[PDB]
Design an enzyme around this catalytic site. Structure first.
Site, mmCIF file in Angstrom:
data_model
loop_
_atom_site.group_PDB
_atom_site.id
_atom_site.type_symbol
_atom_site.label_atom_id
_atom_site.label_comp_id
_atom_site.label_asym_id
_atom_site.label_seq_id
_atom_site.Cartn_x
_atom_site.Cartn_y
_atom_site.Cartn_z
ATOM 1 N N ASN A 95 0.855 -1.174 0.000
ATOM 2 C CA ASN A 95 0.000 0.000 0.000
ATOM 3 C C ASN A 95 0.902 1.239 0.000
ATOM 4 O OD1 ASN A 95 -2.329 1.618 2.261
ATOM 5 N ND2 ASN A 95 -2.461 1.419 0.030
ATOM 6 N N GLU A 145 -10.359 12.912 6.540
ATOM 7 C CA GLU A 145 -9.519 12.456 5.437
ATOM 8 C C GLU A 145 -10.482 12.413 4.253
ATOM 9 O OE1 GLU A 145 -8.434 8.276 5.446
ATOM 10 O OE2 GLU A 145 -6.534 8.738 4.456
ATOM 11 N N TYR A 151 -11.366 12.296 -0.186
ATOM 12 C CA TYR A 151 -10.979 11.828 -1.509
ATOM 13 C C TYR A 151 -11.940 12.308 -2.583
ATOM 14 C CZ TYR A 151 -7.984 7.967 0.378
ATOM 15 O OH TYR A 151 -7.035 7.183 0.993
ATOM 16 N N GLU A 197 -2.658 6.313 -5.322
ATOM 17 C CA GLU A 197 -2.600 5.340 -4.246
ATOM 18 C C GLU A 197 -2.708 3.950 -4.857
ATOM 19 O OE1 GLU A 197 -5.238 6.071 -0.940
ATOM 20 O OE2 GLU A 197 -5.119 3.998 -0.237
#
Length: 190
Positions: free
Chosen positions: A44, A86, A88, A177
């Site tokens: 990751n 967080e 996205y 990512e």
């Protein structure tokens, strides 16, 4: 240049590169707002360029090539403090939709496509302030792309209507990512 995990400023832009230590990932800071990530059977990782701190009205431009081979995302990614959030704004992803297992709150039209809005809670997970519990906000683009312009205000406003109040903006970058996959990408941020 090709570097090990870390953060800083490169050619005028803030950068952040992190990986779980599994290996199989190569991050390289390019000229201007460019960065290249090449991975193969990785773990990751999250890498990209942008700003520190970001804003709530910034129009982010990105262009380049994004070639995922498995689980991977290309998005406007960042954090907020008080509340710790967080977020996205996914522009493109590989084989796995990151909204899987998330609760859909609504939809928003921005920059030539409708986005599905989601929210998930991460209990006792690492963050910019260490291990903590925080919400994770998502905006997944229906029409995938590797080049375009994102008007963050449209997303932050849509999220605010669903019950989200962002506080102090920390970093805001265009990140790649990867999750135990392979691929390559060269993105330039403006």
């Amino acid at each position: 240049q090709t570097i090990q995990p870390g953060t800083g400023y490169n050619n005028g832009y803030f950068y952040s590169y992190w990986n779980d230590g599994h290996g199989g990932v190569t991050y390289t800071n390019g000229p201007g707002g460019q960065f290249s990530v090449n991975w193969s059977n990785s773990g990751n990782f999250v890498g990209g360029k942008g700003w520190q701190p970001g804003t709530k009205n910034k129009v982010i431009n990105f262009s380049g090539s994004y070639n995922p081979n498995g689980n991977s995302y290309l998005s406007v990614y960042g954090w907020s403090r008080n509340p710790l959030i967080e977020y996205y704004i996914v522009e493109n992803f590989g084989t796995y939709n990151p909204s899987t297992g998330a609760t859909k709150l609504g939809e928003v039209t921005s920059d030539g496509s409708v986005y599905d809005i989601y929210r998930t809670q991460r209990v006792n997970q690492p963050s910019i302030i260490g291990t903590a519990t925080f919400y994770q906000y998502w905006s997944v683009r229906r029409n995938h792309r590797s080049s375009g312009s994102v008007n963050t205000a449209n997303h932050f406003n849509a999220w605010a209507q669903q019950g989200l109040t962002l506080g102090t903006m920390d970093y805001q970058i265009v990140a790649v990512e990867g999750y135990f996959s392979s691929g390559s990408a060269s993105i330039t941020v403006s």
